Design a protein around this nucleic acid. Structure first.
Lengths: 251, 108, 212, 212, 108, 212
RNA sequence: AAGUGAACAGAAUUAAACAGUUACGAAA
């Protein structure tokens, strides 16, 4: 890690709308009791304030402005990225998968004024509303996935099955990953040339490395070819997964 | 340009290619040293390297059996006559790189 | 008062050397350790970072006594020539080199030249088995000039080492010719030769005393 | 303190040897074992990589007490002369060679020669048939001089071991004359001979004591 | 230069060429050793090799039947008189390679 | 430990032989296989490649236990003397030859000679007819000597059988005297004669045992 | 003074064709 930090603003959705007429399901009951709506907002208010301090153990964080709407977290980015998606998993089980959640992880520089640091991290949530209501942005306004898709594809197999494959090829071959994140930059130019050039710099990482272990690069070569040539929108998942691994081991 | 290079190069004959990347360092040395030099000066000035580039695809074609079977399929001698302009030569330099990337993916 | 003394010279490479550069970003033939060149043309330009560090290393071993443990911290008579990152009295250095380019292209093509760089074949022996790992490197041509200009400037106020700074630069450039330049030059690849070492005044504020 | 001792000598080839050049990279005559030459002219030059690896090989088999398993790791009395990639005390060596060029062109043209390198025809016997596989090689001329300069320098601190290092360099150059140099020297092609072995001082900081 | 050399060399007589590229290494050893030397010094200095180069195309033309049939068709003795400058000699050295590379393209 | 034994001898030619030089590559006379000579002078020198392929062939048919079918694979007592392209224990050969030059020119002109090479008229008869194909050859001089040197060295470990190797070299050189050397010596052309077979120590690390 | 045309095959091959000690150093 380096001297950076991440700023996330968790804001649950499906709260301002469908709040008064969201209990209709049967023509028998009226579902308009005031006590039904009182316990609906009180049960969720306990998780976004009291239960946050309980899950803050064994980690260095600092909650700012606690509430049942929008919060403000700041600290070391070595765990906020992993804790933001982990906190959402506890809200889905509490609601049985009925209320979505959104946020906005934003990284900036060190010793920056809050007037513009905390203002630019909020535009990622508004820019992510172009799709529908369940989306989130990472660094810039280009990695606008489906929020929940980040853990089912990028954090699923694109992040767990890479922590011990390329780790053995680090140090002596750390500069070999810089050519991979840069090759996927020029994509709107020519599509036929972007595919043939990728097949040249990828096969060179099999013979140069240690050939004593066959199961060291075979699992990484097959997954890297399928994750790139399958869909136009799927290439953004493999590009973001390889970028987060560079910041993991650095300095 | 680069889409047909994955099917025409794969369709060959017997597997286990005995030709690697070290024995082809003679005919592939002038292709990379031409695209980076034709952009500086004009095309009508370099008249000695253009005629010598065709000789490399003829003398090395009758010595090894792993050379004639690739030129006739990829049509290398056919594209050497259509080129005549500096902009057209830039396209032929990019087609040669497609026959090398897909060759090392299936073997070496 | 404040002049810009320029020491124009012609670096003649008596032996082809090797300098490591960017790999796997040039062309498809990025093997045999391709030497970095011009980002626009194909003229092999020499970097200026390899000259400022090599000249200071060979000079900080006969003009000083304390062993240099970390950069920007060795004596004081030579710290003002290149620079000092830990000192506050001075920051900018007086010795400014330049990324010289091969200006010999005006008559090099007339003598019949295939390419500007050639690939040299080498190998190694493990001293217990036969030949293994046939590696290969890439060198440059021989007898090529370069437009090297030394941008020198004085601080006007502390102007009393002019007669002393001239004998240091002349001794540093002459001693550099007796040593390799670049990378992997221990086998005899570097060894430059500064040809036509003359001085001139471009700004016009100080006279001309010596020439070589 | 810090001197630049130069051991100038003339390498006289008593027997024409062979040096494997850059195969499949030259012109149309890339067969018959192409010998590396000058990238600009046609004067054949000898590389310096074949001299540093051969002199260290013959030296690491008489002045040691342990079989060298891997390079850059054999004894210690000779590791500081050529270098060490696994040591943490010293890195840069004290012996720098140079790509010598054929300086015998001042009188070679007066005798009227055909070319600088000739083509020798050889073959082999399969011990079951007559002539098979008519191969061919390439050799150089005989009795040719080469400007060989040995760049020697001390690190000031290593001053009490100067006379001990002179007997090692002299023993390595004399023993190299009784062994083939270059390539394909098993049939009797190498065997060099250092002519006019003298020493001089260029920087001027150490006295002149040794000579032959 | 190189376009008319692929049709004139192919038009011969009976097939199965008994002449290989090893029996003509005498007249082809001086042309390859002259181009690399003429690019260094001047042309008026080397006067003993220019007159000797023409003798190789005459002495070897009466000792083998596979030599006279090639010189009269390719017109080799005609180009030996038109040359007189160092730049003109460089053009004749490149044309000689067409009679060797294209000769082994159809056989050997 | 590491010694350099030199077996100086004089190869006296009792009969003029013929060695096929570089065909179709000579100067003014390239008729009937021009014999290879010196690239600088005119004295015909004998190549060292013929002394390695002929001595090993005649020795691999008397000191072996299996019929050989390919080079670098015959018995084991003689594989370490010339080399082995399959065994990983040793690769370099302990026997180093040298292109022996004709040192008899200091007194050859006193006896009244014409030239160094002459044309011998030798043809063939087709039995069924008269003279057919009147060919010819080119032989050298008769009763000439050559200053041959045999560079021998040990690898320290190869010391407990030094006397075993002396009887192999002495038996191989004596057997070569009763056989033609060079090429097409079936008509009585070769048959060498090693004169003054002595040994000496140049490096000085091993005692002198043999002499005659 | 006397038919004289060195004839006929293989045209460089089989190992090995990037191995390792390793990465923003001290200010805001």
């Amino acid at each position: 890690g380096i001297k950076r930090l991440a700023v996330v603003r968790l804001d649950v959705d499906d709260l301002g709308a469908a709040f008064m007429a969201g209990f209709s399901r049967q023509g028998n009951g009226q579902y308009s009791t005031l006590s039904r709506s009182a316990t609906f907002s009180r049960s969720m208010s306990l998780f976004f304030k009291v239960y946050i301090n309980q899950f803050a153990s064994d980690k260095k964080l600092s909650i700012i402005y606690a509430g049942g709407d929008d919060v403000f977290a700041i600290g070391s980015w070595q765990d906020i990225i992993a804790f933001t998606v982990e906190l959402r998993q506890n809200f889905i089980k509490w609601t049985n998968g009925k209320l979505t959640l959104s946020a906005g992880i934003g990284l900036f520089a060190d010793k920056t004024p809050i007037s513009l640091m905390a203002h630019q991290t909020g535009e990622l949530e508004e820019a992510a509303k172009g799709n529908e209501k369940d989306s989130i942005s990472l660094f810039s306004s280009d990695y606008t996935f489906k929020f929940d898709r980040f853990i089912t594809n990028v954090y699923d197999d694109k992040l767990e099955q890479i922590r011990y494959f390329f780790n053995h090829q680090d140090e002596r071959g750390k500069n070999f990953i810089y050519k991979l994140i840069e090759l996927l930059r020029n994509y709107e130019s020519e599509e036929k040339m972007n595919v043939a050039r990728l097949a040249y710099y990828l096969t060179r990482l099999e013979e140069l490395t240690d050939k004593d272990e066959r199961d060291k690069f075979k699992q990484f070569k097959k997954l890297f070819f399928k994750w790139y040539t399958n869909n136009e929108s799927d290439r953004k998942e493999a590009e973001l997964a390889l970028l987060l691994y560079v910041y993991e081991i650095r300095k | 340009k680069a889409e047909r290079a994955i099917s025409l190069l794969e369709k060959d004959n017997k597997g286990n290619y005995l030709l690697t990347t070290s024995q082809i360092r003679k005919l592939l040395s002038l292709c990379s040293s031409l695209y980076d030099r034709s952009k500086e000066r004009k095309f009508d000035e370099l008249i000695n390297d253009v005629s010598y580039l065709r000789v490399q695809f003829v003398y090395q074609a009758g010595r090894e059996i792993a050379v004639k079977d690739l030129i006739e399929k990829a049509q290398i001698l056919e594209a050497l006559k259509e080129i005549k302009d500096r902009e057209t030569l830039q396209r032929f330099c990019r087609y040669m790189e497609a026959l090398v990337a897909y060759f090392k993916f299936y073997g070496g | 008062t404040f002049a810009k003394i320029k020491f124009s010279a012609q670096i003649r490479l008596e032996t082809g050397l090797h300098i490591g550069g960017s790999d796997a970003f040039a062309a498809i033939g990025a093997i045999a350790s391709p030497v970095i060149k011009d980002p626009i043309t194909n003229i092999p330009i020499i970097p200026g970072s390899s000259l400022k560090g090599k000249m200071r290393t060979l000079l900080a071993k006969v003009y000083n006594e304390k062993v240099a443990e970390k950069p920007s911290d060795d004596s004081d008579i030579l710290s003002r020539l290149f620079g000092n990152s830990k000192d506050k009295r001075f920051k900018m250095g007086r010795l400014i080199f330049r990324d010289a380019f091969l200006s010999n292209a005006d008559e090099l093509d007339s003598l019949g030249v295939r390419s500007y760089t050639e690939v040299k074949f080498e190998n190694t022996i493990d001293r217990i088995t036969a030949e293994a790992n046939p590696r290969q490197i890439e060198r440059a041509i021989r007898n090529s000039t370069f437009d090297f200009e030394l941008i020198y400037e004085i601080t006007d106020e502390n102007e009393n080492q002019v007669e002393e700074d001239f004998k240091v630069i002349r001794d540093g450039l002459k001693l550099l010719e007796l040593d390799y330049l670049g990378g992997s030059g221990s086998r005899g690849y570097g060894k430059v030769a500064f040809e036509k070492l003359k001085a001139t005044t471009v700004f016009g504020n100080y006279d001309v005393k010596t020439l070589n």
